[PDB]
Every structure is written in structure tokens, then in C-alpha cells.
Structure 1
């Protein structure tokens, strides 16, 4: 239920939230710390009432309606700002990460520094999931070990310098292009070229798109939890819609979605089974908590 204990979030599934006796009680056909940091995430087969919303409103409990398992995040309550200029009088807990994000965002130098930190975290996740953890490999995802290490080292040696955002984007594209071929070799799926715009008919392409959708939903949940808007991207262009969501999701995109997609293509599993496997893997690695921690660290390590 506790999707991300680092942020105090809860996931409710197949239960009706209502108020009887002045206290919210989730009558499933639960003991929750109703306080300024509760942040419920209602899921499949859940219905809420107006009284439930009122009692969750005079407790500082932000409420969001997410999909099945946690992603996507359809709609959620809006987090307020803890800026001293405003004086929000409520039981809520306004966040203070938007202030730091705005304070570092406009200078291109600090934006680039944060983007390079993002890429470093991405590569570290690749090396941890692909090599340090053999659970995926033992599941049937034997890799070329040394080749992946060489590619990660080359990507790090390219990202550690060459300023300008386009250079970082090109480096990320090259890393992904090499990584896809390495994964194809590892799983022996054969020759494979990713079809842009989600037009591919191969199992790998559709599974990769589904994983992209799940990761984007998770990133939206993380940004909503922290309170940063989606516009203030760090990697993508300032004109890209939902840039921050894509940047946050890219941390766990290549590390987890690619191996699970290739393994599900090998096994020939259905889309629902692949999605369930992806959700289980994301739960295992504390993906949401990792993205929240990475955003918090990026914000704090630039002041």
C-alpha cells in the first residue's frame, strides 16, 4: 500500500472511501495516519464521496486518482507553495522545492549541471540494474557484461564534458542506440530497430511504448508529490510539452523497461502480463522513491 514511504504516499484499491461517524473509513467489499502528510492515491475500483473529500481536505491530505497499480496519474490535488510571500492558512504542508527549482532553473549553467547529474544517475542505474543485480539476468536476460560496462564507461566519458544541451541530448541518444542493440544481442531477439511514434508492430516496440507510458505516469506522480510543474524541464528543450516528466522518467526508462520488455517478448506473454511484470519490477527497485530522491538531491545540491 505504501508506494513511497520516503514521501508518505498510500495506494487504495477496490474500496469505497466514505465518512461515517466523523472519521473516514475505507469500506472494502484500514488504519492510515490521517495527517498533513498522508497523500492517498486512489486506484482501480475505488469511489470517494464529498464528505470524504471534506475530511481529507481539513487534514492536509492531498488526493489523486491514479491508474491500476500506481500509473498513470489521471488527476490529483494541487500542491501549494510554502513561499513566505503567500500565507496559506490550512492544515496542508506547502512544499518548498519549486522555489529552489525556479532559483536554479533560469541560469543555463546550473540547468546544464542538473542535466548532467540526471544523466549520471541514469547511467548509474543502468550499471546497477544490468550488472550489479542478476535477478533480471537470472530470469533469462543474460548480457554481454563487459560490453555493457564498456558502453556505460564511454557514455560517462562523453557526458562528463562537452557542454551545450544538444551535446548531452546527442550523447543520450547514442547511449540509448548502443544499449538497445546490446539488449537485443543479450536476449538474442535478433535485429531490431525502434519505431518512432509508436508505429511498430513487433512485440519489442509495443512493449517498449507501454513501458514508456508507465514510466511517464510514474514521473508525473513523482513531480506531483514534490510539487514541481511539468514545464520546468532540465534535459529537454524549453518548448517541449511535459519536459520534466520525460526527464524524470528517463532515469528508470532504460534501466528497467527495456530488459522487461525484451524478456516478455521472448516469453511471448500478453500485454497485461507484461504490464504486471513491469509494475512488479518497478515496485521492487523503489523506482518512485528513487526519482523523488534524485529530484530532491538535484534541487539541494545546486543551492
Structure 2
């Protein structure tokens, strides 16, 4: 039933699927995806109850009955480009993911009312953006400098340099008078993080590629990881009922911007270390995705994401 199925709290479901070259159908009352294997077609199981979302890549198709089931279970479905590229992009247009949100599962009515209460006054939005960044900085510090797992894995980082970078950026964030300056600070923050991550990982010199066009392993992994972050952000913002459109920071170059704004919370605090770490190991995209999802589960990324949205709505009163 629609109830007795959405019992696993969305912030604790322990899967997130990425699929390519398969058909997502229904078989014997279960939602399954089938892959061609030469000898036979193999049916694979999908535990909709323990699932946050599906990401569907190239050569992939879905049937209506599956949508009925997934909607009942409150699972997001997203159509994306092949393994780290936009679904659509032409000239200076990009559409990273096309989302199918459930509409038959009514969602709480308070967070939405707060959000839409403040979303129509730029100053109040700016305050929200500030809160987003301060949370991001906080997550960066906690994760890089206070996680034993990343350290033991070989992510030895220069504490002092990171600390001064964090303090410098945070002060600049406070100085931010309007959005453009805020985005410039975001850019400066971002690459300084790349620089620190790289040379702390023996990667040597590095540069971030543009619009998913990178060749070296690091850029490819970063591009792929972004979609995992997008998926978690999309479900985080849906479960509170906030429409994707109501962005605060990245809204004016992106459709459904709020997903990206949320994703930044987790883009750099995780993912970014794991991407370089896997590149060092000479891992394979299949492995990088597996390890990345394990980190996201351990760190309770979704819970942090959900809490932050609650707080910033809360804090805007």
C-alpha cells in the first residue's frame, strides 16, 4: 500500500542507483531492471523501499507501471547524461538532469510556507545564501580535519593552510555585499580547495575542466560525483515539499537551481577528497561510485542536507 511502504525515513534509506543500458519494468509485482547479457536477459531487483532515487543514463528506458510503483514508494527518478555528462547541452545551455518528482504523495505544508514566505525578497535570500555557505565551511572543516577514515585512507592535508583558507573565505563571505561578489568568493574558495586537495594527495598540479569535458581521471570522477550529489539534493528538497525551482544562489544560470545550491553542501566536504583518492589508486569509475556512495552513507549526508534546509527556513523568520 502507499502507506506501510514509506516507513523507512527518507533520510535513512541506504541505496541510490545509477543504471545504464537497461529497461526498468515491473515483473511479478516487483520493480526490476533488465540488462542484456548475450546468453539471456537478466532481471535485477530494485528495493524501492530502501531507495532514495534512480539515475538513468544512456540507452535506458522505463515503463509506466514502474513509475506507479516508484511514485508510491516516494522514489525520485532522474534522466541524466551518460556517466558524467549533461543529459542536454547546446550553445550556452545545460540541463544536467530531468527530474520526475512524485505528485500523488502529499508532503508537509510548513517548510514550504516558510520558504515561499521569504523567497520573494532578495535581501532575505542573501541571508539564506550566507547561511548555506557558513554551513558548507563548517562541514569542510569537520570532515577534512576531524575524520579518521579519510586520514587513514591517505588524505593527509595541511591543517594550517586549510585553516587560514577557511578563515579568509569566511571573512569574505561576511563582507559579501551582493550575489556577484558571493559567487566570486565561491569560485576562489572552490579552486583553493582543489589546490589543497591535489598536492595533499601527491597528485601534483591540477586544473578543473569545463562543462564535463575533462580528460584526466580526476575531472571525470568529479563530473560523475556531481550527479550523485544532485540526486541526494533532489530527494532532500522534495521530501520537504520545496519545489526545485525556488533557488537562492545558482538559480540564474540553472533550471531547478535549488538542487545545485543544496548539492554544494556535500560537493566539496565529500566527493572531492574521494575523487582524488580514487585517481591515486587508479580506480575504475565503477569503483569510485561504489566508494563514494559508501562515504555518503557513513557521513549521513542526506540528514545534514535536510537539517540545513529546515534550519535556513526556520532561521528566516
TM range (shorter): 0.7 to 0.9
1:262-301 to structure 2, matched below 5 A, reads 262-301=276-315
Report how far residue 9 of structure 1 moved.
12
The answer (yes or no) to whether the contact 2:14–2:297 under 8 Å persists in 1 is no
Once the two structures are superposed, residues 259-284 of structure 1 have per-residue CA deviations (whole angstroms, 9 ceiling, x without a partner) of: 00000000000000000000000001
The answer (yes or no) to whether the contact 2:84–2:227 under 8 Å persists in 1 is no
What number of residue pairs does the alignment pair up? 303
Call closer, same or farther: CA 1:3–1:138 in 2, change over 3 Å.
Answer: farther
The answer (yes or no) to whether the contact 1:65–1:74 under 8 Å persists in 2 is no
Once the two structures are superposed, residues 67-117 of structure 1 have per-residue CA deviations (whole angstroms, 9 ceiling, x without a partner) of: 999999999999999999999999945433222111101111110000000
Report how far residue 54 of structure 1 moved.
8.1
The answer (yes or no) to whether the contact 1:231–1:244 under 8 Å persists in 2 is yes
C-alpha distance in 1 between matches for 2:97 and 2:204 = 54
- Structure 1: tracts of 5 or more residues without a match: none
1:215 aligns with 2:229: yes
Higher strand share: 2
What SS is found at the alignment partner of 1:163? coil
1:10 corresponds to which of 17, 24, 36: 17
Call closer, same or farther: CA 1:160–1:87 in 2, change over 3 Å.
Answer: closer
Call closer, same or farther: CA 1:249–1:124 in 2, change over 3 Å.
Answer: same
C-alpha distance in 2 between matches for 1:276 and 1:40 = 15
Call closer, same or farther: CA 1:191–1:60 in 2, change over 3 Å.
Answer: closer
C-alpha distance in 1 between matches for 2:276 and 2:102 = 49
Call closer, same or farther: CA 1:88–1:233 in 2, change over 3 Å.
Answer: closer
1:187 corresponds to which of 201, 206, 212: 201
Q: How high is the TM-score relative to the length of structure 1?
A: 0.74
Call closer, same or farther: CA 1:223–1:10 in 2, change over 3 Å.
Answer: same
Report how far residue 147 of structure 1 moved.
0.8
C-alpha distance in 1 between matches for 2:210 and 2:93 = 34
Instruction: Provide the aligned C-alpha RMSD in A.
Output: 6.8
Call closer, same or farther: CA 1:89–1:184 in 2, change over 3 Å.
Answer: closer
Report how far residue 5 of structure 1 moved.
3.9
The answer (yes or no) to whether the contact 1:81–1:96 under 8 Å persists in 2 is no
- Structure 2: tracts of 5 or more residues without a match: 1-7, 37-43
The answer (yes or no) to whether the contact 1:208–1:257 under 8 Å persists in 2 is yes
Once the two structures are superposed, residues 229-284 of structure 1 have per-residue CA deviations (whole angstroms, 9 ceiling, x without a partner) of: 12111112445312111100000001101100000000000000000000000001
Report how far residue 161 of structure 1 moved.
2.2
1:35 aligns with 2:49: yes
Call closer, same or farther: CA 1:45–1:136 in 2, change over 3 Å.
Answer: farther
The answer (yes or no) to whether the contact 1:114–1:298 under 8 Å persists in 2 is yes
What SS is found at the alignment partner of 2:251? coil
The answer (yes or no) to whether the contact 2:32–2:46 under 8 Å persists in 1 is no
Call closer, same or farther: CA 1:41–1:238 in 2, change over 3 Å.
Answer: closer
The answer (yes or no) to whether the contact 1:16–1:28 under 8 Å persists in 2 is yes
More moved, 264-273 vs 80-89 = 80-89
More moved, 55-64 vs 282-291 = 55-64
Q: How high is the TM-score relative to the length of structure 2?
A: 0.71
Call closer, same or farther: CA 1:78–1:291 in 2, change over 3 Å.
Answer: farther
Call closer, same or farther: CA 1:107–1:24 in 2, change over 3 Å.
Answer: same
1:1-303 to structure 2, matched below 5 A, reads 4-5=11-12, 92-303=106-317
C-alpha distance in 2 between matches for 1:178 and 1:77 = 29
Call closer, same or farther: CA 1:64–1:7 in 2, change over 3 Å.
Answer: farther
The answer (yes or no) to whether the contact 1:59–1:92 under 8 Å persists in 2 is no
